[PDB]
């Protein structure tokens, strides 16, 4: 990815990464750094312990309040 | 609902409420206070502006970091 404009990276347990850009664009790359389409409504477990899901170009994350 | 053990309520825009209990049980009731089954992998817009989705007995919420 071009990290110039990346505002956030979710490092996923399977090795892949989800990047969010400053214009709100979103990117995923696989464990080898290859662009791939982000799965919609698939829960994705992160390296730092939480879980995210994308739906309608938005990222939802496990609610820490709970 | 019995609010004795309710640790969290999401007040949804359509009038319904999602309650989370201290044992991690989860409940939904409709705009009239009737028990209903919580939709899985359906995005649900809240009265306070955010969105939640439930998947595998867990609640995900829009990531405010973004």
């Amino acid at each position: 990815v071009d990290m110039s404009n990346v505002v956030k990276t979710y490092d996923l347990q399977d090795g892949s990464k989800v990047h969010v850009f400053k214009d709100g664009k979103m990117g995923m790359e696989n464990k080898f750094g290859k662009s791939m389409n982000m799965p919609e409504g698939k829960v994705m477990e992160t390296r730092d312990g939480t879980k995210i899901i994308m739906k309608g170009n938005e990222i939802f994350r496990l609610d820490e309040a709970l």
Side-chain angles (χ1 to χ4, degrees), chain A residues 20-38:
Chain A
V20 179
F21 302 99
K22 195 231 169 273
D23 63 8
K25 281 187 170 51
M26 229 167 264
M28 184 166 200
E29 52 173 20
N30 69 16
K31 73 180 81 157
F32 309 105
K34 305 294 140 163
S35 131
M36 58 171 285
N37 292 324
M38 199 184 320

Side-chain angles (χ1 to χ4, degrees), chain A residues 27-58:
Chain A
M28 184 166 200
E29 52 173 20
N30 69 16
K31 73 180 81 157
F32 309 105
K34 305 294 140 163
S35 131
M36 58 171 285
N37 292 324
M38 199 184 320
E40 194 165 321
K42 194 214 202 167
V43 173
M44 290 171 296
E45 201 175 302
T46 78
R47 250 157 66 195
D48 84 330
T50 196
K51 297 173 190 164
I52 67 160
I53 183 178
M54 188 265 283
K55 216 125 178 187
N57 201 14
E58 288 186 306

Side-chain angles (χ1 to χ4, degrees), chain A residues 11 15-17 19 28 33 36-38 44 56 62 64 66:
Chain A
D11 290 281
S16 60
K17 300 191 191 317
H19 310 288
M28 184 166 200
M36 58 171 285
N37 292 324
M38 199 184 320
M44 290 171 296
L62 274 174
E64 292 299 325
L66 318 164

